[PDB]
From a paper:
Each monomer was refined with 115 amino acids. The r.m.s.d. for superposing Cα atoms of TvMIF trimers with the hMIF-1 trimer is ∼1.1 Å, while that with hMIF-2 is ∼1.2 Å. The hMIF-2 structure has an inhibitor, 4-IPP, bound in the tautomerase inhibitory site in the amino-terminus. The N-terminal residues of His-TvMIF obscure this inhibitor-binding site, which is otherwise accessible in both hMIF-1 and hMIF-2.
T. vaginalis evades host immune responses by producing homologs of host proteins, including cytokines such as macrophage migration inhibitory factor. T. vaginalis macrophage migration inhibitory factor (TvMIF) helps to facilitate the survival of T. vaginalis during nutritional stress conditions, increases prostate cell proliferation and invasiveness, and induces inflammation-related cellular pathways, thus mimicking the ability of human MIF to increase inflammation and cell proliferation. Thus, TvMIF facilitates parasite survival during infection and binds to the human CD74 MIF receptor, triggering epithelial cell inflammation and proliferation pathways linked to the progression and pathogenesis of prostate cancer. The production, crystallization and three structures of N-terminally hexahistidine-tagged TvMIF (His-TvMIF) reveal a prototypical MIF trimer with a topology similar to that of the human homologs (hMIF-1 and hMIF-2).
Residue numbers in the entry:
A (entry chain A): 13 to 114, 119 to 127
B (entry chain C): 13 to 127
C (entry chain B): 13 to 80, 83 to 127
């Protein structure tokens, strides 16, 4: 099983800031889900036109895919840990949007 | 209970046009789904390499996620209403692609908490 | 029915390279799934910040959605990856997602199925 985190935001990040974010956010996913960082895939797209709640204020949309291992308990801890990274980096917690989505391919073969 | 709309297109929009698109498209989703505009999330990515039907002509790809409130009936009106915005803004109706994806409250996060 | 392929990668493609990729990748999807090339939708986003397995080396993320298998999944995984390994990518840096949907959860030309 290998988790995936897809992030879209209207904030502007530098090339270094994006590199640190995918590292820090990927490590958060590794901790909450109990998987090694080797199995973690992180995608970050900045400068995206976003409107959340009628406003185009700084916001982020996130999707967390993982074959299994997602439950009411884990989703709440992942929501809190992922959101704090953003609230610690200039974001507002009410502008952060997370979807959990638990049939996968890797190196040309399925599992 | 909050819907999400993710839009990818190869057209080039100005910053003002992108702001207008997310507002108009967001209000379309609010009307069709029966939610206030406060709960609507809209994402618009322009200038993405798109090929639909072998051609890289002007096209758009769309995904609509919503905690519940997604049914065979609603999806049909949402498909029609969203397409009309594009056909009214320089797109051709046969180049528009929509995917509907309902999810649960436990599988959704907001303000560091689920539902 | 109608397949959809959404690709995210941190590699930098030229405008011509992107056009060739969506054609070649689109044709691979049409062949493996047994559907005409007319119903295939391909999206390619380059220059996306990607970190896979802790490393930000060249990588690609893929999602393949289709209304409604073990046979295709093996062929689609292998055929799509081979395109990338033939274009400077590493096969263990290629990430594919299969997402079957229902007829009522798909839209085209303002109507569902
Ligand atoms: Cl920079
Ligand atoms: Cl812990
Ligand atoms: Cl996406
Ligand atoms: Cl501009
Ligand atoms: Cl160029």
């Amino acid at each position: 099983s290998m988790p995936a985190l897809v992030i879209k935001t209207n904030a502007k990040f530098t090339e270094e800031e994006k590199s640190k974010a995918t590292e820090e956010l990927g490590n958060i996913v590794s901790k909450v889900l109990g998987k090694p960082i080797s199995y973690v895939m992180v995608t970050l797209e900045d400068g995206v036109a976003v409107r959340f709640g009628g406003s185009d204020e700084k916001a982020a949309f996130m999707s967390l895919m993982s074959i299994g291992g997602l439950n009411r308990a884990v989703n709440k801890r992942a929501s809190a840990a992922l959101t704090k990274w953003f609230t610690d980096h200039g974001f507002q917690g009410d502008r952060i949007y997370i979807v959990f989505n638990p049939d996968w391919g890797f190196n040309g073969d399925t599992f």
